[PDB]
Design a binder for these strands. Structure first.
Ligand SMILES: [Mg+2]
Ligand SMILES: [Mg+2]
Ligand SMILES: [Mg+2]
Length: 430
DNA sequence: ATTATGACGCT
DNA sequence: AGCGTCATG
């Protein structure tokens, strides 16, 4: 009754750039704009591997993780942009720098959590309180929500998409109680007004379009963001959760798209996230552990407490390269050359990070994969990172991994290495 | 021979 | 610490 908390205490948004690497390339090269186009890494093997796809190209069935030659079978007119190559490897600096552009704009509106290169969570609770104080009880005009969908509406007693969007928005705004400054639905609505403004600012100042979700917590905001892409935002109210979850496959919720979600489905014999409500918190903890069980019990009712962390910068700076099939590194000279290439990219990025952000990394993590290991990482080992010097870092990494060489010969490396990864971690202020 | 990242949990 | 899981541009 009155004591069951409803998880409506915060307003949280998730902003996600649409097809981000494609947009970065389309800004640079106007010939790619409003075209089926994709971004690829490398070229020789099957035309390169696609990592980002414009919505025009998605209409033909082009997806990430598809080889460009195969995508061209689906979409003969597909345009491609290649990721930069430096020191023999893909270099993602252009997209990291574009990400910083966007994150700095978002940070003007609220403190953000950088969830990935192209997405950030926003805690809007305080900004919403402020805007409500300025509103003085004035209703919210639909004109202030020109790209907002209200999930679950319209409902009840036109055949165009924008018409449906506006009917739903109208139903939502008509049912709104604008004099209660503590109404969660009103708070979400003002949150959506702010996110319209943030998305307008991102597009004006960068050229980049994004989608967003507005709800009461991170998981619902992420889910909402995905409901209407691209270039749109979606409000998921607490009240919309029972219907939304009643047909929502468990794998769609962040953290349940892998083994844990599969085990929820198999152990409980259910398919949809709403079906979780029929289990006690202790039942879910018995199957999935204390933490997961409590999380699932609350999440299937729309409630989640994970805070938006005040963190706009990545916690690690890493450099990785796979050496698949026949390109696996089989000589010590080879291993040392590539460790050096990775370490030189790492040094460049670290020195820039130190100048920009007033911090220094203090641990170097070295990870490798050996031929025939099913796992993505075969071995992970840390050592001290005391100097931003590529030759030192690569010599230290070699010292850390050199006992992996099974070869009786010092010149040969066996089993050959199919992946090298250098990562700088544990930053301290400087 | 989907690749290059990045965050976080477990023990 | 080192390993596994989840996300996926
Ligand atoms: Mg995106
Ligand atoms: Mg994203
Ligand atoms: Mg994506």
């Amino acid at each position: 009754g009155p004591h069951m908390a409803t998880g409506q205490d915060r307003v949280v948004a998730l902003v996600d750039m649409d097809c981000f690497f494609v947009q970065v390339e389309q800004r640079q090269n106007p010939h790619l704009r409003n075209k089926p186009c994709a971004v690829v890494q490398y070229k020789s093997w099957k035309g390169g591997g696609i990592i980002a796809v414009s919505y025009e190209a998605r209409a033909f069935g082009v997806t990430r993780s598809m080889w460009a030659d195969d995508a061209k079978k689906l979409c003969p007119d597909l345009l491609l942009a290649q990721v930069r190559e430096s020191r023999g490897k893909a270099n993602l600096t252009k997209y990291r720098e574009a990400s910083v552009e966007v994150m700095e704009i978002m940070s003007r509106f609220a403190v953000i959590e950088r969830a990935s290169i192209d997405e950030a969570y926003v805690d809007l609770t305080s900004a919403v309180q402020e805007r409500l104080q300025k509103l003085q009880g004035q209703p919210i005009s639909a004109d202030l929500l020109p790209s907002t969908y209200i999930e679950g509406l319209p409902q009840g007693p036109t055949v165009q998409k924008e018409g449906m969007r506006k009917q739903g928005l109208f139903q939502w705004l008509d049912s709104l109680q604008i004099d209660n400054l503590t109404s969660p639905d009103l708070q979400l609505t003002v949150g959506a007004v702010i996110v319209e403004e943030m998305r307008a600012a991102i597009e004006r100042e960068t050229g980049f379009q994004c989608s967003a979700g507005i709800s009461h917590n991170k998981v619902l905001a992420k889910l909402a963001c995905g409901l209407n892409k691209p270039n749109r935002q979606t409000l998921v109210s607490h009240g919309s959760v029972p219907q939304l979850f009643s047909q929502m496959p468990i794998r769609k919720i962040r953290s349940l798209g892998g083994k844990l979600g599969a085990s929820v489905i198999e152990i409980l014999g259910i398919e949809y996230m709403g079906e979780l409500t029929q289990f006690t918190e202790s039942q879910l903890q018995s199957h999935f552990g204390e933490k997961n069980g409590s999380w699932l019990y609350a999440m299937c009712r729309g409630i989640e407490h994970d805070p938006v962390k005040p963190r706009q910068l990545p916690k690690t700076i890493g450099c990785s390269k796979n050496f698949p099939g026949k390109t696996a590194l089989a000589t010590r000279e080879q291993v040392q050359w590539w460790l050096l290439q990775l370490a030189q990219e790492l040094e460049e990025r670290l020195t820039k990070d130190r100048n920009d952000n007033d911090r220094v990394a203090t641990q170097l993590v070295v990870s490798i994969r050996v031929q025939g290991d099913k796992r993505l990482s075969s071995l992970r080992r840390c050592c001290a990172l005391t100097r931003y010097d590529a030759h030192k870092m690569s010599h230290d990494a070699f010292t850390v991994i050199k006992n992996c060489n099974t070869s009786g010969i010092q010149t040969e490396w066996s089993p050959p290495l199919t992946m090298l990864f250098l990562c700088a971690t544990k930053f301290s202020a400087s």
